[PDB]
Amino acid sequence: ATFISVQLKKTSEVDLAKPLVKFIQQTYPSGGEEQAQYCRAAEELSKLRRAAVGRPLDKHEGALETLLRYYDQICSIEPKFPFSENQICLTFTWKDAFDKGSLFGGSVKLALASLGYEKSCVLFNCAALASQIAAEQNLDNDEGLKIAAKHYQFASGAFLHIKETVLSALSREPTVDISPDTVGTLSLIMLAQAQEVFFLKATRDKMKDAIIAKLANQAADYFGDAFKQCQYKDTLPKEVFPVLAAKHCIMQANAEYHQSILAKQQKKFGEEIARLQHAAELIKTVASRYDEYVNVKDFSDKINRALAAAKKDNDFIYHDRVPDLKDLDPIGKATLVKSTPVNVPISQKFTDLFEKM
Amino acid sequence: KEEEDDDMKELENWAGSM
């Protein structure tokens, strides 16, 4: 199993308190003892930023809920200080998730006095960490599967929320990592892996071959489209394009392999052989082109075992004509997977720290 | 097709229980 996940964006420590302590008294007069409610609490928010975006990470629900909490919070803090005319002074500096920068002095950074920019990069890290948690799941068990599928669909919907949002939300030209192109592609990647997780669930549950083939066929589409978005781009890490190329073929081969079990079941022995020849050809291409990225050995053997048996008996007994691929019916497509919309609150049991403001 | 109910449905339930 070879799953793609995204590295978290770096940020630098900022004193979120100082710049907000000030902009709290206006025609809210209480300069006596009342304002200090919106202050011990407006730096529970500051230590929350440091917890959310501050340490090297736990890849568990612990660290993820903190990031989600922090995202919920900034979204709620937005209109309090009417930020259509921004006059709170705060500058958030984030490093590009992907761009190295030349070792001709330093990385690729962007500093912006914006809540827009902040909530964007935070949601990036929520999506990215969720992708990391998904990829670490043990897929040999049902709850491993359930958690990977849940988080891949979350990360897909969250990268996609950034796509439709970064440009309006920000003033400047985004870094390439959060720009709509990169993030539309990450979103598709996550959605493809979520679909793969469903195929892997049908496979564990030894569900019907017709079903597994339609799940596999839809995954091949998602992976196909994602690699096409990366063909002419070198934004994402180098392993990404070859992994997506290989899984587009592996998923096509799974579709053909399972649809071939259905053929055999229905005594269409020539169609069985034709589908299995396709599957072996796909897997042979992956084995020779992408082998430093995937191990396709057991599957290749399994196909080659079914093909050999099918051919012996067709040549000896049935003498069905092996049809041409273009004369076979298309395998269907079954999608079981959506980009999860971002609707604050996204964190579990959220309470707004500034709810009475 | 009486199991393509029984299989598709039980993943649409796995799905909603997320």
Asked if A274 and A307 count as a contact pair (C-beta separation under 8 A), the reply is no
With CB atoms and an 8 Å threshold, state whether A336 touches B18.
Answer: no
Chain A partners of B4 at a C-beta cutoff of 8 Å? 208, 210-211
Chain A partners of B15 at a C-beta cutoff of 8 Å? 336-337
Asked if A127 and A186 count as a contact pair (C-beta separation under 8 A), the reply is yes
Residue A62 Cα, gap to closest chain B Cα (Å): 18
Asked if A163 and A127 count as a contact pair (C-beta separation under 8 A), the reply is no
With CB atoms and an 8 Å threshold, state whether B4 touches A210.
Answer: yes
Asked if A45 and A16 count as a contact pair (C-beta separation under 8 A), the reply is yes
Question: How many of the other CB atoms lie within 10 Å of CB of A32?
Answer: 7
List, in sequence order, every residue forming a beta bridge with A112; answer none if it has no partner: A92
Longest dimension (CA), chain A: 97
How far apart are alpha carbons A172 and A110 in whole angstroms? 9
Residue A286 in contact with partner chain B when CB distance is under 8 A? no
Please say whether the structural domain A1-357 has been given the CATH code 3.40.50.970. no
Residue A111 φ then ψ, to 5°: -110, 120
Residue A208 in contact with partner chain B when CB distance is under 8 A? yes
Question: How many of the other CB atoms lie within 10 Å of CB of A15?
Answer: 13
Q: Domain spans of chain A?
A: 1-357
Residue A27 φ then ψ, to 5°: -105, 10
Residue A201 in contact with partner chain B when CB distance is under 8 A? yes
Q: Which two tokens stand for residue A11?
A: 């940020």
Cis link prior to A345 (omega < 30° from 0)? yes
Chain A partners of B3 at a C-beta cutoff of 8 Å? 208
Resolution of the structure in the document, Å: 2.1
How far apart are alpha carbons A340 and A347 in whole angstroms? 14
Nearest one of A296, A298, A303 to A258, comparing CA atoms: A303
Q: Which two tokens stand for residue A156?
A: 């897909």
Residue B2 φ then ψ, to 5°: -80, -5
Question: How many of the other CB atoms lie within 10 Å of CB of A203?
Answer: 15
How far apart are alpha carbons B12 and A72 in whole angstroms? 29
List, in sequence order, every residue forming a beta bridge with A109; answer none if it has no partner: A95
A147 contact partners, CB below 8 Å, separation of at least 6: A133, A134, A137
Residue type, A133: I
Asked if A211 and A334 count as a contact pair (C-beta separation under 8 A), the reply is yes
Residue A322 in contact with partner chain B when CB distance is under 8 A? no
Nearest one of A71, A63, A17 to A43, comparing CA atoms: A17
With CB atoms and an 8 Å threshold, state whether A202 touches B11.
Answer: yes
A267 torsion bin: left (phi>0), alpha (psi -120 to 50), beta (else)? left
